[PDB]
Amino acid sequence: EFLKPRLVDIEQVSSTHAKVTLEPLERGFGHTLGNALRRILLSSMPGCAVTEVEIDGVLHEYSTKEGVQEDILEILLNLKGLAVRVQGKDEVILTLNKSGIGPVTAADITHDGDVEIVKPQHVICHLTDENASISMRIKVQRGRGYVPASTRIHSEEDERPIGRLLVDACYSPVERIAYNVEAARVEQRTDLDKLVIEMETNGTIDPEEAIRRAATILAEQLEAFVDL
Amino acid sequence: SVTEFLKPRLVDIEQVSSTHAKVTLEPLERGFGHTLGNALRRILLSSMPGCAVTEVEIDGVLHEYSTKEGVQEDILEILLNLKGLAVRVQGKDEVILTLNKSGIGPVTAADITHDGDVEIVKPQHVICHLTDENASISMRIKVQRGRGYVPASTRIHSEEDERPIGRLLVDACYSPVERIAYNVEAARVEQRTDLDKLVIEMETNGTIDPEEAIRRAATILAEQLEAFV
Amino acid sequence: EIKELLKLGDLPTSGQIRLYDGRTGEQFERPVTVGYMYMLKLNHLVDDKM
Amino acid sequence: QDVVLGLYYMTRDCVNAKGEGMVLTGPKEAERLYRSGLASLHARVKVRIT
Amino acid sequence: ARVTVQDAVEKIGNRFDLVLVAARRARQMQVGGKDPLVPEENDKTTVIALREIEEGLINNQILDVRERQEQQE
Amino acid sequence: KPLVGTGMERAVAVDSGVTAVAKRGGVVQYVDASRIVIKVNEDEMYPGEAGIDIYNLTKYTRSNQNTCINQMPCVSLGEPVERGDVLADGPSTDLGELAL
Amino acid sequence: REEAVVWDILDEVIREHPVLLNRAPTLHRLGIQAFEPVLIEGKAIQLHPLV
Question: CATH assignment of A1-46+172-228?
Fold first, then answer.
């Protein structure tokens, strides 16, 4: 006769990170589920990191497009750290177009309905001329884990045009997880615990949805021990 | 392609005699080796519903630092031997048992009274050795259905009364298992290499074999998670 | 002076923290030393040596 | 080096740790106590060994 | 499967005659037919030689004997 | 940068040459990953020859040990600079500090 | 071309085949030992710690 926890609340302490709470738990399941969920949530979550970039007037990722104060390579890193959410398809082609002195926020990307940018203060590159212009096509797709360019670069032989720069994917929303087990509060009974998870995030994945998908994964895995 | 993992294909169940089993699963996704190993380890080893001896009261003993002639063992050694006993209990919750016997020679577990529902698993076990005509042993052993592992940690004074002198306490080991030690070693699929291979290795005191051991652990955890998904 | 600076921060005086093992999730015994050390790469690379 | 340290730490004894002087029925449940965390890795103890 | 040759050395006291006898037997297996006398577990001819030695059913004496026999034949 | 240095980074990185130490302090007129174009303060200028200063950075090129020697503008447009000051991070220089 | 048959071929031609490892300033006759190989990713020879 055990008990079973629930999701007593999802305290949204900020735009990025929140604090889910589980209650109640038995003596020990606190640390058990805590560690299991931390390890899952860090490993396996669906992200939407950028995969391929194509600036219009650049051959390879080492030149300097005239008029913008950052190497194409540093522009490319600042893209690698982009954070975006897609719902319908598994891949989309965002488009950036900009001209004139001033920064280039991420919000300048066209806002196709199925795509939600999540941080319009994010800066790609600084333009530094009146009549200077950049325009790029950015391919963003689903994924899981970490997938370098050196792996995909051997994943298809059909020719790739000269000009498609390949960023490394970082398909992962969670950034930092912690948990504390502490004293619970239930019907006239002590020796029950409350697990308090705390998850940093790009902002893409809802906390409750994250914790629920992690639980689903782990139940799917245990569907193999329960039968031998 | 995004919620589509691997599941353990081949399941070795290679077992030494009847309680020292050894299970290998492969392939597990990169980094589930430890998560499943640790989850099942902690569950099996701290929370498994079992039945075990809790307290014992000898006829003519008042304290651990005493003795009783005819018995080449000591109070302490027989308390160990009774930790080692392994009982399974039917619908009874807790139950007392009696262990009267005299006679020059060893005393084994089969010499215990059986008392209907209660069942012993090793009739072949050993408790104490007697050597004198008039010497005898008369203890009231007590088994209880419990949910973990409970030492005798500061309990002669925990209970808010004085238990009568003679209430010897025994470290209760309820859970069946006696040893679980996962491992992790690299296994490979025809392309990938960074994968995992779980090797559970397990013994149980006898009341139930490794199979239902792991099945129950998986089930407990599966329900705790059935909460969410 | 280092003790005084750490204590200006919210960090422990000894400079040693408790750490938790990533695998088993259970605490380490005997707090360990953490900090930020400035590390360097060296042009003796495996793919130029193999 | 690491292993000799691990051993020199695994086989020693402080005076009053957890699980001081409680009797154990064998190396198996000695490991089981240490793993469940009810007794510090090294507190002196009477065990039946064969 | 094979890790240590200690039993082979026990049944051929030299630990060099081990190399010689084992190599000769392994050539018998690898070059000219002559299926082994132990259930091979896909171990190679070398391990199979050392293994037959551990079974004590091959040594320099038996090799000379059986070579002489077949050569007369 | 290194959190814990010994202050000699400044001298080493400024006098190693890898960076582009501005000569006549002025106001930055134009920044660009290729060149940097500085307007000179007035009192630091010759009667004739007035003009302005131009620093042509050296983009990705080869060292003698095959590492990539490179430079990056660190000052942003419309910003004072003074005599004897950095404008371009060399290889392994952070704001004119020797960050290996 | 490293077509995907050679890796199975290579497992079968490794299984029980010792290779000699050596360390540069060899001094005493333990400076050369044998080992059976185990294929690894990466580019570094791995070595048991008790050696």
Answer: 3.30.1360.10
